Design a protein around this nucleic acid. Structure first.
Ligand SMILES: [Mg+2]
Ligand SMILES: [Mg+2]
Ligand SMILES: [Mg+2]
Ligand SMILES: [Mg+2]
Ligand SMILES: [Mg+2]
Ligand SMILES: [Mg+2]
Ligand SMILES: [Mg+2]
Ligand SMILES: [Mg+2]
Ligand SMILES: [Mg+2]
Ligand SMILES: [Mg+2]
Ligand SMILES: [Mg+2]
Ligand SMILES: [Mg+2]
Ligand SMILES: [Mg+2]
Ligand SMILES: [Mg+2]
Ligand SMILES: [Mg+2]
Ligand SMILES: [Mg+2]
Ligand SMILES: [Mg+2]
Ligand SMILES: [Mg+2]
Ligand SMILES: [Mg+2]
Ligand SMILES: [Mg+2]
Ligand SMILES: [Mg+2]
Ligand SMILES: [Mg+2]
Ligand SMILES: [Mg+2]
Ligand SMILES: [Mg+2]
Ligand SMILES: [Mg+2]
Ligand SMILES: [Mg+2]
Ligand SMILES: [Mg+2]
Lengths: 97, 57, 164, 55, 203, 145
RNA sequence: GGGGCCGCGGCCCCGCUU
RNA sequence: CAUGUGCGCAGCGAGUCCGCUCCGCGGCGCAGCGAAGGCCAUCGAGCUGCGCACAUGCGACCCGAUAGGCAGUGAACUACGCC
RNA sequence: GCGCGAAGCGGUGGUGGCGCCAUCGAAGGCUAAAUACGCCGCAGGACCGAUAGCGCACAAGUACCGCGAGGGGACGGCGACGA
RNA sequence: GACUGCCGGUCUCCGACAGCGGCGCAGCCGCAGACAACCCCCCGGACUUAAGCAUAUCACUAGGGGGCGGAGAAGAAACCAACAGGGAUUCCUGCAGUAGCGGCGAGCGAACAGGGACGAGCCCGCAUGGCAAUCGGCAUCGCCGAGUUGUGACAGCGCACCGCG
């Protein structure tokens, strides 16, 4: 009776820890939301420009084909989450131009 | 005995006068070299040295 | 095969199957006792065990009981008043990957460090330590005592008050 | 008993089909091998240490 | 930092810059022999992540490996066996192409120890790798506490035993549910433990 | 007693017949032929051997699915022997029985309770007869964690 | 057969060489 | 030898099992049914060891193929070609 | 292996996709102990006792055979070693 | 100083080079060859079982190639989990002949736990700029070299150890 025991499940009442702050673990220190040097990413994007599939995805975005750009970038990258974020990184390029 | 006192304080002694341990043991790192550790391992052992203690309940 | 029996599940079809016999089992035990004695004699005042935390066991089968954990979190050592790198120099085990989940496991382990450090006598160096004449602790430091659960009792007029 | 390159010589040689020791030039050559009834043969069902010694 | 600018430039492998330097590096690596000693790292920042220092006794050897799978070496497809084992032409090696590059650099400089290797280029025919190799007899290494572990005798031919980063990847090592094939140290260590019958004294 | 071989010394065809024999593997090895020539052995003694039943659970977890039941009869047997005498000889005192502390998760309603007095029982699940038997006597069925 | 095999030019075609 | 089953014997018995270990809340049993959601008894002696018989996997009562494979060695006989 | 080719957040959640929630931080490196094991040394043993036990208790991998790779035996005993 | 014992000397020749490689390198070194029980990496059968047989099985074995060490390998979570959460690896017990895989046939077949043995954790990279603070070599306190395409750090060891009974 798996669903019934899961539904009738009662958590043990326990007290959460409200006060303490985490000690930074040595060797495990990252700010994952601001990872790289953002000036270094801007410089290399200025030098190197865009990849050929990124140029093709701008041409889909600029020609009002963001549906086809989504299919194209999903086929290129292979992951939907990076596909969504690549497209909004590329519409920001197409909007500033 | 004569050739030892000739090349005792030599940079490279002749191979006759070095101890013939084993090719593997001649190529071993020295105990000084094995004890070599990086600066963070030195500071940590220095700042948190070995403690000598006894526990009783 | 012939008769009514459970269907055979005997897996000796591979000719590569080895056998691990246990003829060393009484001999390994006497070697294991001798090494434990020599470890205790190498660290004469210091206990042979680390101080280890009391953690709750993981799944729903086993979360009714507590066992002895791997190490204390650094936030437990700080609340007890110790640097975790200092805590390793005295006989306390430190676990960097255990997460401080709740106040009950946290405060129990913080008290467990405080009881332990209160029970320590320090010595100046190794020669002062060996000549102390202090009896060292053998076995697990402050183990959780296994007991049969006591049955709690309430009065029958109080039953509707407690559990309506 | 199993340290030979012994093979049966087969039928047709007026000799029993037991494995014979290979080679020539020695007295061991052509003699029976590998069988419990053979001299210097492996005993059939050889004793093992995986026997249950304790009860 | 400088290492960040070198890294972000290195990630853009389809630039006009990278396709140019990809073309002339792959040209220059192909004119040399299969394993030949490089002068310096092509990507020094990438080599510094793999343990290269600009010290005496650390060498860079450059190895190319022909790409693709490795066919079964039999005469005319005759594998002399069951038809399940009769395949020839879509087989893939168990170890990496990069681990083959460490084997060739390791056999060439038999005095040196393979530290790591890294990709420096590829085309349709070849994959080019630079292999970081360490001299365990040079005193600059033996006095180095970050690196004199490779001077120990257990580090002889790390690439031949699957102990470098490229060669360890073929072994199936790892933590957790997906890597149960190698619990115990290796596949043979796990297979061995699973195929012994433990016969205790009192059973 | 000794083995059977010690009596079969002297008789040709140790115990396996002259016309038959003790041959190597007549019939095949193992339990092969379950649909061909040992089908009578499987139609008789293992008629549920072949085929598939039911929904496969890739990696069933034993500890997560652990829920051993206890009948409501044996609830009073969970009280420790020392503590049980002061509870049986006190009628205004009801015992609180945390079944999870004793390794029991479900309370099923088999048989009768050992004493007709209120008991407060804590478990993960109670069957409807287990609730009805316990709460008729004046006790409580509490779904504990 | 398709893809990968990082070159320039001009009208799939034609030059070119690196 | 492993794992079963049956019988006999043995200890304890709603429990039982020393022999992994420095200390089994591990297994099985005290209750089952269903693929499952779900249902849950009107209910039942087992556990462990020892011994035999028997089944199965193993070299498998002993001896026996023709074969197949993997790795090797031979053109001093003989076949051909070259010097 | 090949094609494609990431990210500042990413991986994973017995493994269709997507979303949640939860939990970790890969693609760099080292690390004792508990673990395995032949020769050999040592000590034992409900083992075998010269057709047995290792192939060999002996001038045993010896004699001997095979172009070669290789194959491979047999054979123990006076007494008070004083006569 | 007989006969002995322990240790050390001497230790022919063939057999490890078309050698290969490291270091500015007057030169100094390393690799090769053995070992094949244990261990690591790659290559990889068939007999056999399926009463035939082709997938399966044998078996990710045998075997071959390569490579170490006194052990090796592994190893400080991009882990397990779904709890009130545990916490490197290895080993034992156990999960368990189970979930599952499988001409769903023959057969194959783990994992988390729980208990235990043992326990230990660390590091490179993005290090100063009021000056490479670092290292190698030497015929040595001075040269030469490495190096800014970036160098940089010491906690553990040792000796002694009978002669009678
Ligand atoms: Mg014999
Ligand atoms: Mg240089
Ligand atoms: Mg074949
Ligand atoms: Mg007969
Ligand atoms: Mg009979
Ligand atoms: Mg007949
Ligand atoms: Mg038929
Ligand atoms: Mg039998
Ligand atoms: Mg035969
Ligand atoms: Mg065939
Ligand atoms: Mg052949
Ligand atoms: Mg996440
Ligand atoms: Mg799941
Ligand atoms: Mg890491
Ligand atoms: Mg005799
Ligand atoms: Mg003999
Ligand atoms: Mg002849
Ligand atoms: Mg070699
Ligand atoms: Mg066989
Ligand atoms: Mg068959
Ligand atoms: Mg047959
Ligand atoms: Mg056939
Ligand atoms: Mg060695
Ligand atoms: Mg290791
Ligand atoms: Mg298998
Ligand atoms: Mg540095
Ligand atoms: Mg006397």
């Amino acid at each position: 009776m798996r669903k019934k025991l899961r539904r009738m499940r009662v958590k043990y009442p326990v007290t959460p820890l409200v006060g303490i702050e985490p000690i930074p673990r040595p060797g495990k220190k990252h700010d994952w939301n601001n990872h790289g040097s953002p000036m270094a990413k801007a410089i290399a994007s200025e030098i190197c420009g865009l990849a050929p599939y990124e140029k093709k995805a701008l041409e889909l975005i600029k020609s009002d084909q963001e549906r086809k750009c989504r299919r194209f970038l999903k086929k290129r990258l292979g992951n939907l989450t990076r596909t969504k974020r690549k497209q909004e990184a590329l519409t920001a390029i197409a909007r500033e131009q | 005995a004569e050739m030892y006192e000739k090349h005792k304080n030599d940079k490279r002694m002749p191979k006759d006068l070095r101890p013939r341990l084993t090719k593997a043991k001649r190529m071993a790192l020295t105990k000084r070299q094995l004890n070599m550790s990086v600066h963070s391992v030195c500071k940590r052992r220095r700042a948190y040295p070995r403690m000598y203690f006894s526990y009783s309940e | 095969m012939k008769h009514n029996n459970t269907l055979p599940n005997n897996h000796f079809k591979k000719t590569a199957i080895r056998f691990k016999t246990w003829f060393n089992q009484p001999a390994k035990k006497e070697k294991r006792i001798q090494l434990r004695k020599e470890k205790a004699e190498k660290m004469y005042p210091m206990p042979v065990e680390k101080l280890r935390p009391i953690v709750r066991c993981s799944s729903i089968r086993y979360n009714i009981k507590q066992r002895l954990g791997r190490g204390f979190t650094p936030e437990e050592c700080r609340a007890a008043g110790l640097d975790y790198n200092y805590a390793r120099t005295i006989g306390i085990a430190v676990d960097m990957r255990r997460k401080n989940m709740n106040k009950e496991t946290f405060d129990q382990n913080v008290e467990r460090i405080k009881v332990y450090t209160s029970r320590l006598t320090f010595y100046k160096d190794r020669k002062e330590a060996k000549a102390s004449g202090a009896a060292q602790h053998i076995g697990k430091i402050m183990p959780p005592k296994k007991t049969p659960p006591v049955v709690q009792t309430i009065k029958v007029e109080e039953i509707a008050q407690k559990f309506p | 008993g199993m340290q030979h390159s012994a093979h049966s010589w087969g039928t047709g040689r007026a000799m029993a089909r037991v494995p014979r020791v290979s080679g020539s030039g020695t007295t061991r050559s052509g003699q029976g091998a590998f069988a419990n009834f053979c001299r210097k043969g492996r005993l059939a069902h050889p004793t093992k240490v995986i026997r249950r010694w304790q009860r | 930092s400088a290492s960040e600018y070198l890294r972000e430039i290195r990630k853009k492998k389809q630039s006009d810059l990278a396709r140019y330097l990809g073309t002339i590096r792959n040209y220059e690596f192909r004119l040399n022999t299969a394993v030949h000693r490089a002068e310096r790292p092509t990507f020094p920042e990438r080599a510094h992540k793999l343990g290269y220092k600009a010290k005496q006794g650390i060498c860079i050897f450059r190895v190319r490996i022909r790409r693709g799978g490795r066919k079964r070496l039999v005469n005319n497809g005759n594998t002399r066996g069951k038809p399940v084992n009769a395949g020839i032409y879509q087989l893939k090696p168990a170890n990496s192409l990069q681990s083959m590059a460490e084997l060739k650099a390791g056999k060439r400089a038999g005095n040196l120890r393979v530290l790591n290797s890294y990709w420096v280029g590829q085309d349709g025919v070849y994959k080019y790798f630079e292999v970081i190799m360490v001299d365990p007899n040079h005193n600059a290494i033996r006095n180095d506490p970050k690196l004199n572990w490779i001077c120990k005798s257990t580090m002889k031919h790390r690439e031949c035993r699957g102990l470098t980063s490229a060669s360890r990847k073929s072994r199936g090592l790892g933590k957790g549910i997906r890597y149960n094939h190698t619990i115990g140290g290796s596949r043979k260590a796990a297979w061995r433990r699973r195929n012994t019958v433990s016969l205790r004294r009192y059973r | 007693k000794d083995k059977k071989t010690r009596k079969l010394r002297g008789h040709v065809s140790h115990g396996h017949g002259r016309v038959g024999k003790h041959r190597k593997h007549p019939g095949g090895r193992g339990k092969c032929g379950g649909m061909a020539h040992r089908k009578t052995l499987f139609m008789k003694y293992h008629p549920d051997h072949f085929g598939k039943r039911g929904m496969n659970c890739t990696h069933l977890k034993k500890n997560a699915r652990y829920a051993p039941p206890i009948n409501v009869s044996k609830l009073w047997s969970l009280i420790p022997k020392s503590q049980l005498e002061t509870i049986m000889n006190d009628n205004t005192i009801a015992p609180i029985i945390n079944c999870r502390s004793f390794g029991y998760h479900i309370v099923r309603g088999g048989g009768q309770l050992s004493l007709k007095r209120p008991i407060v029982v804590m478990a993960r699940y109670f069957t409807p007869k287990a609730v009805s038997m316990i709460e008729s006597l004046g006790g409580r069925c509490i779904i504990s964690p």
